[PDB]
Design a protein around this nucleic acid. Structure first.
Ligand code: K
Length: 290
DNA sequence: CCTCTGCCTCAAGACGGG
DNA sequence: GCCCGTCC
DNA sequence: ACTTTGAGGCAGAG
């Protein structure tokens, strides 16, 4: 994500962070990064050193995680759309089996040209969902107006939901969106390096004073704060500001009734889940729809 | 103050019975 | 409520 | 990634 950004916001713009009750999200739609979440399931849902799996050794940890997490959100009246990345390893088989499961649950999903986080942001911008619920601060860096942070952790711990508001962030820092991108690069982004010596304090000052990365190097003393060689900040700046994304007007998001017999055939027949648990999950899914 | 860096420890996904 | 054992 | 791995606290040097 962005190295330090949540702590920085809590340190300098805490009013951009709202603590809200899970009950106030009832009826809201939220975009969720399927690629990221599959990966977390592959790491966490383990037994005796291995993922869960059927008799033939096919992994089911991603399905276990995605089935019950999705039911849990719907039971809270939060209607999710999952976004799959575009251009422990998450395979194509993981993706396709999670997509199959979600159709069978009646849960929508979209495929993203490139970065799921950015395309999640594009759904928020366009008003197609209320927020992105992801664990990546870079959603804010991609321009997303609202980001629900640690939704599942808060749900389990019966804790209030941290909700980051990009507009209040810019207002407290005195920064436009373009200038906020450059800050996040200085903090440390996935795309390129950060200047050694320049931490969260020094980064905010220079951005507020000078307003752009290229300006910074000119005013910076090269001897004291040398930038790394062939620094790709220009390209990273371009990846955040104008990312390849899907069209949020393009696909209608619809939430359908779950296809129980096909879910039994697939989760129980093939993947060898317990039939009682799958029916019990479906029943809660039906009740959630109301 | 400000950034490193190194040394430490401590859940982690979800459900449900006890 | 909180532990833990178990899920496949 | 639980027979491990990252964050997050904390303290000390440049
Ligand atoms: K740095």
């Amino acid at each position: 994500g962005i190295q330090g950004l949540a702590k920085l916001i809590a340190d300098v713009a805490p009013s951009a962070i709202r603590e809200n009750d899970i009950k106030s999200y009832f009826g809201r739609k939220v975009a969720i990064d399927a690629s990221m979440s599959i990966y977390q399931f592959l790491i966490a849902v383990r037994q005796g050193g291995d993922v869960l799996q059927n008799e033939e050794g096919e992994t089911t940890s991603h399905l276990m995680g995605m089935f019950y997490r999705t039911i849990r959100m719907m039971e809270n009246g939060i209607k999710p759309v999952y976004v799959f990345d575009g251009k422990v390893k998450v395979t194509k088989q993981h993706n396709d089996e999670c997509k199959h499961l979600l159709s069978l649950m009646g849960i929508p999903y979209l495929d993203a040209p490139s970065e799921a986080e950015a395309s999640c942001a594009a759904l928020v911008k366009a008003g197609k969902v209320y927020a992105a619920a992801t664990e990546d601060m870079a959603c804010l860096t991609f321009g997303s107006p609202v980001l629900m942070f640690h939704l599942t952790a808060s749900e389990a711990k019966k804790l209030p939901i941290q909700e980051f508001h990009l507009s209040r962030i810019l207002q407290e820092l005195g920064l436009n969106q373009e200038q906020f991108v450059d800050l996040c690069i200085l903090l440390g982004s996935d795309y390129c390096e950060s200047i050694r010596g320049i931490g969260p304090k020094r980064a905010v000052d220079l951005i507020q004073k000078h307003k752009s990365i290229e300006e910074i190097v000119r005013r910076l003393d090269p001897n004291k704060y040398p930038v790394p060689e062939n620094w790709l900040h220009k390209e990273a700046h371009q990846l955040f500001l104008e990312p390849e994304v899907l069209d949020p007007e393009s696909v209608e998001l619809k939430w359908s009734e779950p296809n129980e017999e096909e879910l039994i055939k697939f989760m129980c027949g093939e993947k060898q889940f317990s039939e009682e648990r799958i029916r019990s999950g479906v029943k809660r899914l039906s009740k959630s729809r109301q």
